């Protein structure tokens, strides 16, 4: 019943039944480094989580065909069928458009869909149509409605093309159903309050230290180690974290206490995993189990409530702030709590001051985890750092 | 013209499977296969319907429809947007080199023969389609087209003394 | 609701649906008539015909809710009448400005103003049984904040043309040119 307003972050998912197996494939865009889009596996999120950060778009304007053609020949509105929309990528800030070149030799007549900077022309606009006879043009669209996206320039459908390895959405004449899952309703997002899908870091009340990993001077296996550190790391790329929630809809809502969410490292792209024989480390996406990598924030140390909140399909309630919100990390499996150690012996105390973070039952009643969100500049810099270091490391081995 | 293009592209099955699909390439192979089928009577009815000639006529009719359905001679297309879009759709569906190759086949000039095969009228549809969708405005393109598709046919037409069975 | 039968159908909702259809049609025909300040004979006829049709539909809706029947009140409240009426407000706010710059469209302007009067009396007949905290008032303030721009333009129009009956023939303009039938050089009028 909830309508799709403007200036809201939404997700474009679809269902694909290939090889007698159904799957939910999403629309994603890397933005920096490449132009064409690709697909993301929202389903099968048990061992491999989907990168929801790059599968989020925002609707800028919703004009009719006449208004669009008039503006081309030259507000919180409501999305209607038959209108034309402008899908701006939420992260990169570029705009979704229909490219002109071709990549799939199997479709000698289809075009690609990607991102572009300027909003001129008919390529960056997409007209909306229903996928059922019960809704005609001009009616208001609501959540869960199956939609059909048609290019304004090429007059092609945003089609889900099938391939052995080229699972890439293109602009073909065979239609495909697309579901619109809201993330942030664009409503009054409580300033200073914790929002889902945010990139932030942790601090202490009277220690001025942050949770981080070793820098690039050490190997990747040494960067996998986790500890606390102060100083210039307070403003650093390897000190930021992302709360990747488990839901695919409304994941950018007000995060409340107790709900599970993965902790993603923006620089390395890995998650805080835990195997009981050792402490917590960093491990990649291809084996990230939900139970192993799910965490939560408690407001106390007791175990009064664990399975109390199940699912809220909405924006939620503004509960957790950034400054005056002392959280406590709690795993969904072991239920342990953060503890700071003294791994550096007295022989090397005055050198590199690092106190490893071991998660245990008792802990110390002086943690005082204070949230601190990082500006959009810092987040974009850290993610493009990860992307370019990944591409450059692959290039270095491929050339070597 | 606009609604016909819209309907044809919405239901893409109207085009020939040799031209459209994940199988056949396009008009070149279609025309070659039609020529071999027309010459070989093992792929026909053993006044019967020559399947090769019928395939050729179908493709010629489709191309003539697309050509006459092209927007204009750029009278309104110069300042219109939808005309440019329709022209781009037509160009993207049918490649130019395929059309040039199909034009350059140089049918024989025959004691008469049977005209229930590659009729010379099939080339006129391709010529009209080239003129309307692409046109002749490039010197090297015009010269190469004349060289590959017109001089042999022009010689075949000029090589008549009395046996004129095909006007 | 034809109580006594077994498959009752709502005629009020169907009338609202037809009104919404004719409203979107009028909006599209206007989006076609944007930029060109010329209305031909067909451009006059096709507008007057739809104006008469919309006026008749509005009169039918007024008669549906004219008597204080809370049933039809709530039926119009929980329906798609608000979209039709906000579309009509949006098209009026621009036709009122477009038809006034040039002549040969005074008949179209008069018919449109009549249709607007019938529409406003229709939406006024929804409040004859109003309560200080009724739902119809909430919906009405909703459609007002949803079309504040167009209604502000139309109020500016009405205020601008209502501040003229008193601004001219009360203090000075009546004795500027006392010749006979109104004659003005249009330059003394400007300063006036």
XYZ file of C-alpha atoms in Angstrom:
759
model
C 0.000 0.000 0.000
C 3.045 2.222 0.439
C 3.519 4.432 -2.609
C 6.838 5.217 -4.295
C 7.688 8.868 -3.670
C 10.598 10.750 -5.262
C 14.173 11.110 -3.998
C 14.100 7.654 -2.421
C 16.621 4.829 -2.634
C 15.147 1.726 -4.284
C 16.382 -1.629 -5.578
C 15.607 -3.280 -8.926
C 15.367 -7.053 -8.487
C 14.095 -9.805 -10.759
C 13.505 -13.554 -10.767
C 15.371 -15.849 -13.164
C 14.391 -19.500 -13.689
C 17.284 -21.158 -15.548
C 18.329 -24.830 -15.406
C 15.131 -25.644 -13.466
C 16.173 -23.425 -10.552
C 14.804 -20.034 -9.527
C 17.031 -17.177 -8.408
C 16.648 -13.514 -7.462
C 19.133 -11.463 -9.481
C 19.634 -7.761 -8.791
C 20.782 -4.792 -10.848
C 24.191 -3.521 -9.747
C 26.644 -0.930 -11.014
C 30.318 -0.571 -10.149
C 30.324 3.053 -11.287
C 34.036 3.804 -11.061
C 36.280 1.870 -13.430
C 33.557 0.497 -15.704
C 30.348 1.782 -17.277
C 28.171 -1.252 -18.018
C 26.073 -2.825 -15.271
C 25.883 -6.456 -14.146
C 23.865 -8.787 -11.918
C 24.018 -9.481 -8.184
C 22.744 -12.544 -6.316
C 20.331 -11.304 -3.665
C 19.321 -14.910 -3.038
C 21.871 -17.457 -1.783
C 22.855 -14.887 0.862
C 23.737 -17.672 3.308
C 27.363 -18.137 2.215
C 27.846 -15.266 -0.267
C 26.212 -11.933 0.652
C 25.171 -9.514 -2.101
C 26.912 -6.153 -2.437
C 23.767 -4.114 -1.844
C 25.771 -0.866 -1.689
C 26.059 -0.719 -5.495
C 22.558 -2.055 -6.254
C 20.828 1.110 -5.002
C 19.367 3.833 -7.227
C 17.432 7.029 -6.504
C 14.560 8.489 -8.524
C 15.071 12.174 -9.311
C 12.112 13.243 -11.464
C 8.909 11.552 -12.641
C 7.638 13.362 -15.735
C 5.215 12.286 -18.434
C 6.179 11.708 -22.063
C 4.868 15.130 -23.094
C 6.728 16.954 -20.326
C 9.910 14.999 -21.064
C 9.818 15.728 -24.790
C 9.075 19.403 -24.108
C 12.049 19.717 -21.733
C 14.244 17.914 -24.266
C 13.103 20.130 -27.150
C 13.762 23.206 -24.991
C 9.474 17.842 -4.947
C 8.061 14.699 -3.330
C 5.821 13.664 -6.210
C 4.128 10.277 -6.692
C 5.261 7.664 -9.202
C 2.594 6.868 -11.801
C 2.521 4.327 -14.598
C 3.369 5.512 -18.094
C 5.613 8.261 -16.714
C 9.338 8.635 -17.389
C 11.860 8.334 -14.567
C 15.500 9.265 -14.028
C 17.504 6.618 -12.169
C 20.539 8.187 -10.511
C 22.986 5.748 -8.976
C 22.889 6.358 -5.240
C 26.566 5.702 -4.567
C 28.484 6.895 -7.632
C 26.086 9.750 -8.398
C 26.062 8.982 -12.128
C 22.839 8.166 -14.006
C 21.542 4.922 -15.486
C 21.360 5.101 -19.281
C 21.074 2.838 -22.324
C 24.439 2.459 -24.040
C 24.936 2.273 -27.806
C 27.586 -0.426 -28.247
C 27.014 -4.191 -28.241
C 28.768 -7.008 -26.364
C 26.602 -10.146 -26.694
C 27.030 -11.561 -30.182
C 23.974 -13.705 -29.387
C 21.786 -10.566 -29.590
C 22.717 -8.810 -32.836
C 20.042 -6.167 -32.158
C 20.178 -5.385 -28.415
C 21.917 -2.519 -26.613
C 23.676 -2.322 -23.259
C 22.556 -0.504 -20.123
C 25.082 1.404 -18.061
C 25.871 4.666 -16.332
C 26.628 8.127 -17.698
C 27.390 11.493 -16.128
C 25.255 13.959 -18.078
C 21.457 13.800 -18.092
C 21.013 15.077 -21.654
C 19.257 13.089 -24.352
C 16.746 10.266 -24.156
C 19.215 7.568 -23.080
C 19.173 8.329 -19.345
C 15.357 8.278 -19.081
C 13.178 5.188 -18.646
C 9.409 4.992 -19.123
C 7.441 2.755 -16.750
C 4.694 0.293 -17.673
C 2.733 -2.273 -15.655
C 3.162 -6.034 -15.855
C -0.486 -6.869 -15.099
C -3.869 -6.076 -16.603
C -5.301 -4.962 -13.243
C -3.234 -1.728 -13.315
C -3.533 0.631 -16.279
C -1.637 3.847 -16.927
C -1.948 6.760 -14.507
C -2.508 4.664 -11.382
C -0.212 5.071 -8.394
C 2.500 2.433 -8.010
C 2.976 0.714 -4.650
C 5.612 -1.509 -3.075
C 5.882 -5.000 -4.538
C 4.369 -4.090 -7.908
C 5.976 -5.856 -10.859
C 7.209 -3.160 -13.257
C 8.537 -3.030 -16.811
C 11.244 -0.528 -17.760
C 11.440 0.654 -21.377
C 14.161 2.887 -22.794
C 12.976 6.273 -24.012
C 15.669 6.570 -26.702
C 16.056 3.021 -28.020
C 12.475 1.961 -27.145
C 13.900 -1.292 -25.777
C 13.030 -3.214 -22.636
C 15.488 -3.480 -19.769
C 15.810 -7.198 -20.463
C 17.461 -9.928 -18.395
C 19.666 -11.735 -20.906
C 20.891 -15.255 -20.163
C 24.399 -16.554 -20.786
C 26.910 -19.079 -19.532
C 29.113 -16.370 -17.996
C 27.642 -13.179 -19.514
C 24.829 -12.803 -17.002
C 24.426 -9.128 -17.915
C 21.218 -7.127 -18.231
C 20.832 -5.457 -21.621
C 18.276 -3.478 -23.649
C 16.363 -6.096 -25.638
C 12.840 -6.240 -27.042
C 11.768 -9.163 -24.829
C 10.270 -7.759 -21.640
C 11.256 -8.802 -18.125
C 9.514 -8.239 -14.803
C 11.266 -6.076 -12.218
C 10.403 -5.605 -8.548
C 11.161 -2.364 -6.710
C 12.348 -2.915 -3.144
C 12.640 0.301 -1.107
C 15.722 0.960 1.015
C 15.278 4.519 2.327
C 11.877 6.154 1.979
C 13.420 9.606 1.519
C 11.317 10.741 4.485
C 12.748 12.594 7.471
C 15.943 10.636 8.085
C 16.828 11.469 11.683
C 20.048 13.484 11.601
C 22.641 12.156 14.019
C 20.841 8.804 14.236
C 22.211 5.503 12.979
C 20.830 4.512 9.570
C 21.144 1.119 7.933
C 23.805 0.610 5.313
C 25.898 3.429 6.763
C 29.695 3.613 6.780
C 30.930 4.534 10.254
C 33.542 3.635 12.851
C 33.778 3.126 16.597
C 35.428 5.174 19.334
C 35.766 5.045 23.109
C 34.637 7.578 25.677
C 37.979 8.277 27.364
C 40.483 6.335 25.252
C 40.202 8.030 21.837
C 40.918 4.739 20.059
C 39.220 3.089 17.097
C 38.719 -0.442 15.812
C 40.972 -1.024 12.801
C 43.375 -3.427 11.087
C 47.097 -3.095 10.240
C 48.050 -0.886 7.313
C 49.374 -1.999 3.927
C 52.990 -2.218 5.087
C 52.215 -5.746 6.313
C 50.970 -8.687 4.295
C 47.327 -9.465 3.661
C 47.410 -12.215 6.290
C 48.666 -9.653 8.813
C 46.045 -7.107 7.734
C 43.453 -9.803 8.478
C 44.330 -9.298 12.157
C 42.106 -6.960 14.176
C 43.058 -4.574 16.985
C 42.542 -1.093 18.421
C 44.651 1.921 17.514
C 44.779 5.667 18.090
C 46.352 8.732 16.545
C 46.121 9.567 12.844
C 44.080 6.393 12.263
C 41.122 8.377 13.641
C 40.879 9.850 10.128
C 41.932 6.910 7.966
C 40.514 4.670 5.262
C 41.279 1.372 7.035
C 39.295 2.444 10.119
C 35.803 2.580 8.580
C 33.117 -0.096 8.785
C 29.846 -0.740 6.961
C 26.698 -2.265 8.479
C 25.523 -4.650 5.762
C 22.098 -5.787 6.942
C 20.607 -9.159 6.009
C 17.319 -7.926 4.536
C 17.116 -6.944 0.869
C 14.319 -4.390 1.413
C 14.430 -1.400 3.779
C 18.044 -2.245 4.624
C 18.732 1.487 4.899
C 16.293 1.984 7.758
C 16.915 2.925 11.384
C 18.987 0.070 12.802
C 17.600 -0.984 16.178
C 19.159 -2.989 18.982
C 19.581 -6.732 18.597
C 18.996 -7.131 14.870
C 21.723 -8.936 12.900
C 24.006 -7.272 10.371
C 27.422 -7.989 8.890
C 30.391 -5.710 9.575
C 32.162 -5.012 6.280
C 35.639 -3.521 5.956
C 35.517 -0.845 3.268
C 39.221 -1.063 2.397
C 39.570 -4.862 2.218
C 35.972 -5.769 1.375
C 35.974 -8.598 3.923
C 33.789 -9.280 6.957
C 34.522 -9.883 10.633
C 34.240 -13.665 10.785
C 34.663 -15.830 13.869
C 35.607 -19.488 14.239
C 35.564 -20.673 17.825
C 39.060 -22.192 17.782
C 40.432 -18.668 17.231
C 39.365 -15.047 17.664
C 37.650 -12.819 15.096
C 39.454 -12.169 11.813
C 38.689 -10.872 8.307
C 37.450 -13.268 5.629
C 36.219 -12.681 2.084
C 32.684 -12.766 0.666
C 32.785 -16.165 -1.053
C 32.424 -18.043 2.258
C 30.805 -15.499 4.619
C 28.254 -17.473 6.616
C 25.316 -15.633 8.164
C 25.639 -17.258 11.583
C 29.412 -16.749 11.632
C 29.392 -13.106 10.483
C 26.158 -11.802 12.061
C 26.517 -9.302 14.907
C 24.344 -6.856 16.829
C 24.551 -3.890 19.200
C 23.197 -4.176 22.738
C 22.509 -1.360 25.188
C 23.690 -3.393 28.198
C 25.689 -6.497 29.124
C 22.922 -8.898 30.205
C 21.023 -11.403 28.059
C 17.468 -10.255 28.768
C 16.287 -10.242 25.132
C 17.699 -12.014 22.075
C 14.830 -13.261 19.919
C 12.418 -10.364 20.440
C 12.518 -8.455 17.127
C 11.743 -10.434 13.968
C 10.868 -8.143 11.038
C 9.684 -4.548 10.588
C 8.689 -3.555 7.043
C 9.152 0.185 7.307
C 11.530 2.999 8.140
C 11.533 1.997 11.811
C 12.060 4.218 14.829
C 14.935 6.600 15.557
C 16.657 4.808 18.446
C 20.451 4.638 18.021
C 22.288 7.954 17.717
C 25.961 8.522 16.844
C 27.366 10.595 19.711
C 25.442 9.617 22.845
C 24.791 5.955 22.076
C 27.004 3.481 23.957
C 26.634 0.209 22.045
C 28.022 -3.231 22.877
C 28.880 -5.749 20.166
C 27.197 -9.141 20.556
C 27.481 -12.135 18.230
C 24.324 -14.011 17.287
C 26.077 -17.343 17.993
C 28.349 -16.946 21.024
C 26.924 -13.773 22.540
C 30.365 -12.652 23.702
C 31.482 -9.051 24.199
C 34.462 -6.920 23.240
C 37.540 -6.963 25.480
C 40.764 -4.984 25.128
C 44.001 -6.851 25.885
C 47.674 -6.050 26.544
C 49.258 -8.092 23.749
C 52.218 -5.689 23.649
C 54.563 -6.788 26.446
C 56.447 -4.326 28.654
C 59.543 -4.892 26.491
C 57.871 -3.042 23.589
C 55.226 -0.910 25.297
C 56.595 2.477 24.170
C 56.708 1.412 20.511
C 53.617 0.690 18.421
C 50.715 0.822 20.881
C 48.133 -1.767 19.833
C 45.700 -3.623 22.091
C 44.158 -6.618 20.354
C 40.383 -6.943 20.577
C 39.418 -10.367 21.927
C 35.699 -11.043 22.198
C 34.843 -12.696 25.541
C 32.029 -13.089 28.075
C 33.008 -10.780 30.939
C 34.725 -7.799 29.357
C 35.538 -4.500 31.019
C 32.919 -1.963 32.064
C 34.820 0.912 30.439
C 34.427 0.290 26.687
C 31.912 3.006 25.818
C 31.541 2.403 22.086
C 30.714 5.748 20.457
C 29.510 5.817 16.863
C 30.996 8.272 14.374
C 29.791 8.504 10.786
C 32.170 9.371 7.947
C 31.318 11.946 5.295
C 30.352 10.900 1.778
C 33.792 12.042 0.604
C 35.588 9.624 2.934
C 33.301 6.716 2.038
C 33.691 7.289 -1.691
C 37.455 7.569 -1.278
C 37.706 4.322 0.692
C 35.544 2.330 -1.713
C 37.319 3.626 -4.810
C 40.570 2.767 -3.015
C 39.370 -0.814 -2.640
C 38.183 -0.986 -6.251
C 41.376 0.421 -7.751
C 43.646 -1.670 -5.512
C 41.726 -4.794 -6.537
C 41.967 -3.930 -10.239
C 45.630 -2.931 -9.976
C 46.624 -6.046 -8.027
C 44.901 -8.254 -10.593
C 46.659 -6.304 -13.345
C 50.024 -6.689 -11.591
C 49.738 -10.468 -11.387
C 48.286 -10.712 -14.895
C 51.258 -8.810 -16.301
C 53.827 -10.582 -14.112
C 4.891 3.528 -40.380
C 5.595 4.209 -36.704
C 2.911 1.852 -35.414
C 3.994 -0.850 -37.878
C 7.611 -0.653 -36.711
C 6.396 -0.706 -33.108
C 4.258 -3.806 -33.673
C 6.952 -5.608 -35.683
C 9.625 -4.966 -33.062
C 7.310 -5.855 -30.161
C 6.623 -9.229 -31.812
C 10.061 -9.930 -33.331
C 9.005 -13.333 -34.691
C 7.662 -11.678 -37.867
C 11.185 -11.432 -39.297
C 12.667 -14.467 -41.012
C 14.544 -16.921 -38.796
C 17.554 -16.823 -41.124
C 17.860 -13.060 -40.506
C 16.687 -12.865 -36.877
C 17.582 -15.197 -34.032
C 20.503 -16.861 -32.327
C 20.935 -19.106 -35.376
C 21.176 -17.721 -38.902
C 23.336 -14.659 -39.514
C 21.417 -12.520 -41.994
C 20.411 -11.795 -45.557
C 23.660 -12.958 -47.199
C 23.421 -16.563 -46.007
C 19.646 -16.482 -46.467
C 20.007 -15.513 -50.130
C 22.802 -18.024 -50.765
C 20.762 -20.810 -49.167
C 17.756 -19.746 -51.224
C 19.831 -19.891 -54.416
C 21.106 -23.394 -53.660
C 17.611 -24.560 -52.682
C 16.138 -23.095 -55.879
C 18.765 -24.782 -58.051
C 18.532 -28.131 -56.227
C 15.054 -29.664 -56.791
C 15.478 -32.017 -53.798
C 14.189 -29.244 -51.490
C 10.912 -28.523 -53.296
C 7.700 -30.261 -54.303
C 8.403 -33.502 -56.212
C 3.763 -25.159 -61.274
C 4.824 -26.221 -57.791
C 5.878 -23.733 -55.118
C 9.619 -23.187 -55.509
C 10.622 -22.904 -51.854
C 13.826 -21.021 -52.654
C 11.973 -18.491 -54.792
C 9.330 -18.163 -52.078
C 11.992 -17.483 -49.433
C 13.596 -14.908 -51.728
C 10.239 -13.222 -52.324
C 9.478 -13.169 -48.595
C 12.775 -11.485 -47.761
C 12.451 -9.038 -50.662
C 8.934 -8.143 -49.505
C 10.105 -7.656 -45.916
C 12.924 -5.382 -47.070
C 10.557 -3.429 -49.324
C 8.145 -2.982 -46.413
C 10.941 -1.717 -44.174
C 12.225 0.612 -46.892
C 8.848 2.140 -47.703
C 8.216 2.316 -43.947
C 11.389 4.396 -43.364
C 10.518 7.896 -42.081
C 11.190 10.127 -45.099
C 13.925 11.574 -47.331
C 14.976 13.609 -44.258
C 12.435 16.348 -44.931
C 10.824 15.950 -41.511
C 13.631 13.686 -40.243
C 16.112 16.579 -40.295
C 14.248 18.317 -37.462
C 12.344 15.441 -35.813
C 13.438 13.073 -33.070
C 11.210 10.034 -33.509
C 12.162 9.819 -37.189
C 15.834 9.622 -36.199
C 14.954 6.892 -33.700
C 13.068 4.873 -36.326
C 15.963 5.240 -38.769
C 18.404 4.089 -36.087
C 16.199 1.076 -35.329
C 16.087 0.140 -39.013
C 19.861 0.529 -39.331
C 20.497 -1.565 -36.214
C 18.219 -4.378 -37.395
C 19.745 -4.758 -40.881
C 23.509 -4.288 -41.415
C 24.686 -2.294 -44.419
C 27.361 -4.725 -45.602
C 24.765 -7.490 -45.759
C 22.673 -5.297 -48.064
C 25.636 -4.446 -50.300
C 26.574 -8.120 -50.552
C 23.024 -9.179 -51.405
C 22.832 -6.486 -54.093
C 26.061 -7.854 -55.606
C 24.980 -11.310 -56.755
C 25.071 -10.737 -60.537
C 22.284 -13.034 -61.682
C 22.659 -14.763 -65.033
C 21.311 -13.428 -68.337
C 19.946 -16.366 -70.401
C 16.639 -20.270 -75.651
C 14.824 -18.749 -72.670
C 14.873 -19.915 -69.056
C 12.566 -20.024 -66.031
C 12.106 -16.835 -63.995
C 10.729 -18.587 -60.890
C 13.981 -18.055 -59.009
C 16.046 -14.983 -58.114
C 13.940 -12.434 -59.961
C 15.626 -9.106 -60.833
C 12.795 -7.322 -59.002
C 14.234 -8.555 -55.694
C 17.189 -6.202 -56.182
C 14.910 -3.183 -56.662
C 13.602 -3.571 -53.111
C 17.159 -3.588 -51.764
C 18.004 -0.505 -53.845
C 14.967 1.380 -52.552
C 15.790 0.322 -48.995
C 19.360 1.592 -49.315
C 18.177 4.874 -50.798
C 15.596 5.489 -48.088
C 17.266 4.251 -44.886
C 20.913 5.047 -45.723
C 21.010 6.976 -48.990
C 23.859 7.868 -51.307
C 25.882 10.798 -49.969
C 29.477 9.476 -49.727
C 31.742 9.431 -52.777
C 33.724 6.291 -51.922
C 30.571 4.477 -50.783
C 28.752 5.334 -54.016
C 31.748 4.302 -56.126
C 32.232 0.982 -54.318
C 28.511 0.228 -54.545
C 28.538 0.953 -58.276
C 31.608 -1.255 -58.723
C 30.352 -4.247 -56.791
C 26.615 -4.234 -57.528
C 25.864 -2.259 -60.703
C 28.530 -2.730 -63.388
C 28.003 -6.521 -63.747
C 24.222 -6.112 -63.869
C 24.620 -3.163 -66.249
C 26.741 -5.302 -68.578
C 24.227 -8.155 -68.344
C 21.463 -5.724 -69.309
C 23.463 -4.129 -72.131
C 24.377 -7.582 -73.517
C 21.155 -8.042 -75.490
C 20.763 -8.435 -79.247
C 17.466 -10.258 -79.918
C 16.830 -12.829 -77.155
C 15.021 -10.494 -74.752
C 12.888 -12.699 -72.502
C 13.141 -10.461 -69.421
C 12.072 -6.817 -69.553
C -25.401 -0.463 -3.081
C -28.585 -2.020 -4.481
C -29.448 -3.904 -1.306
C -31.639 -6.928 -2.053
C -29.664 -8.255 -5.020
C -26.593 -10.502 -4.804
C -23.924 -8.924 -7.074
C -24.307 -5.215 -6.337
C -22.144 -2.806 -8.344
C -21.173 0.728 -7.345
C -22.214 3.387 -9.854
C -20.561 6.203 -7.891
C -17.103 4.667 -8.260
C -17.706 4.139 -11.977
C -18.704 7.792 -12.391
C -15.532 8.802 -10.549
C -13.517 6.572 -12.880
C -15.042 8.142 -15.990
C -14.327 11.594 -14.571
C -10.701 10.600 -14.000
C -10.464 9.345 -17.586
C -11.852 12.562 -19.041
C -9.560 14.567 -16.742
C -6.413 12.783 -17.914
C -7.644 13.206 -21.492
C -8.064 16.961 -20.987
C -4.613 17.157 -19.404
C -3.042 15.371 -22.377
C -4.909 17.544 -24.890
C -3.515 20.567 -23.066
C 0.019 19.202 -22.985
C -0.453 18.981 -26.745
C -1.615 22.611 -26.773
C 1.459 23.969 -25.002
C 3.689 26.640 -26.542
C 1.488 27.331 -29.568
C -0.718 30.349 -28.844
C -3.220 29.513 -31.594
C -6.555 27.727 -31.138
C -8.218 26.772 -34.415
C -11.894 25.977 -34.943
C -11.282 22.305 -34.158
C -9.175 23.331 -31.167
C -12.232 25.255 -29.972
C -14.828 22.563 -30.680
C -12.891 19.678 -29.126
C -12.433 21.760 -25.978
C -16.043 22.958 -25.707
C -17.334 19.402 -26.167
C -15.169 18.043 -23.353
C -16.021 21.077 -21.208
C -19.718 20.264 -21.558
C -19.099 16.578 -20.825
C -17.087 17.383 -17.697
C -19.707 19.901 -16.570
C -22.431 17.271 -16.898
C -20.356 14.711 -14.986
C -19.708 17.255 -12.233
C -23.416 18.091 -12.012
C -24.156 14.373 -11.732
C -21.653 14.062 -8.888
C -23.174 17.114 -7.180
C -26.596 15.476 -7.348
C -25.147 12.243 -5.968
C -23.888 14.002 -2.818
C -26.321 16.936 -2.747
C -28.537 15.452 -0.060
C -26.602 14.908 3.168
C -26.049 11.208 2.435
C -22.981 10.143 4.412
C -22.793 6.996 2.281
C -21.956 8.829 -0.927
C -19.840 11.259 1.103
C -17.560 8.444 2.265
C -17.685 6.769 -1.161
C -16.311 9.914 -2.797
C -13.889 10.337 0.109
C -12.368 6.865 -0.346
C -12.000 6.984 -4.117
C -9.919 8.514 -6.919
C -11.802 11.825 -7.107
C -8.873 13.745 -5.625
C -6.597 12.905 -8.557
C -9.234 14.116 -11.022
C -9.837 17.355 -9.146
C -6.133 18.141 -8.716
C -5.609 17.511 -12.428
C -8.475 19.887 -13.155
C -6.904 22.485 -10.858
C -3.570 22.079 -12.655
C -5.130 22.501 -16.093
C -7.212 25.485 -14.960
C -4.229 27.304 -13.453
C -2.613 27.333 -16.911
C -5.650 27.759 -19.180
C -6.745 30.801 -17.181
C -3.353 32.405 -17.805
C -3.068 31.290 -21.449
C -6.547 32.273 -22.666
C -6.358 35.823 -21.281
C -3.444 37.207 -23.320
C -5.324 37.095 -26.637
C -8.864 37.519 -27.933
C -10.971 35.057 -29.995
C -11.055 32.683 -27.002
C -13.477 34.490 -24.679
C -16.092 31.780 -25.249
C -13.603 29.077 -24.259
C -12.638 31.102 -21.190
C -16.290 31.536 -20.199
C -17.066 27.834 -20.596
C -13.953 26.918 -18.613
C -14.860 29.332 -15.815
C -18.342 27.785 -15.729
C -16.821 24.303 -15.493
C -14.591 25.539 -12.672
C -17.615 26.930 -10.833
C -19.392 23.587 -11.157
C -16.282 21.739 -9.959
C -15.863 24.000 -6.935
C -19.536 23.685 -6.004
C -19.114 19.913 -6.356
C -16.207 19.817 -3.916
C -18.108 22.244 -1.670
C -21.142 19.935 -1.536
C -18.805 17.463 0.197
C -18.716 19.651 3.325
C -22.404 20.368 3.968
C -22.397 17.804 6.777
C -18.899 18.561 7.980
C -17.523 17.964 11.471
C -14.658 19.788 13.171
C -12.510 16.645 12.824
C -14.032 14.834 9.857
C -12.093 12.816 7.309
C -13.293 14.903 4.355
C -11.595 17.978 5.794
C -8.341 16.045 6.124
C -8.587 14.885 2.511
C -9.363 18.441 1.389
C -6.350 19.919 3.165
C -4.380 17.013 1.684
C -5.354 17.936 -1.891
C -4.633 21.561 -1.046
C -1.088 20.922 0.131
C -0.779 18.551 -2.855
C -1.665 21.290 -5.352
C -0.598 24.421 -3.487
C 1.262 25.787 -6.509
C -1.675 25.729 -8.911
C -4.190 26.900 -6.331
C -1.855 29.744 -5.320
C -1.661 30.756 -8.971
C -5.450 30.691 -9.335
C -5.955 32.718 -6.137
C -3.443 35.264 -7.409
C -5.456 35.387 -10.643
C -8.744 35.975 -8.808
C -7.243 38.521 -6.409
C -5.591 40.394 -9.286
C -8.882 40.617 -11.195
C -10.952 41.353 -8.072
C -8.670 44.237 -7.047
C -9.697 46.010 -10.273
C -13.419 46.687 -9.802
C -12.569 49.021 -6.904
C -9.120 50.219 -8.000
C -10.480 51.909 -11.135
C -13.949 53.378 -10.543
C -13.557 54.623 -6.990
C -10.989 57.432 -6.682
C -9.392 58.828 -9.847
C -9.886 56.713 -12.981
C -13.586 57.593 -13.301
C -12.789 61.293 -13.888
C -9.624 60.923 -16.002
C -11.449 60.918 -19.360
C -15.080 62.021 -18.883
C -16.140 61.998 -22.536
C -18.698 59.204 -22.877
C -18.172 55.529 -23.604
C -14.841 54.416 -22.185
C -11.976 55.842 -24.236
C -8.356 55.585 -23.071
C -5.092 56.249 -24.904
C -3.680 53.216 -22.976
C -0.735 55.363 -21.827
C -2.580 57.329 -19.160
C -4.100 53.977 -18.194
C -0.620 52.543 -17.608
C 0.405 55.280 -15.181
C -3.081 55.165 -13.648
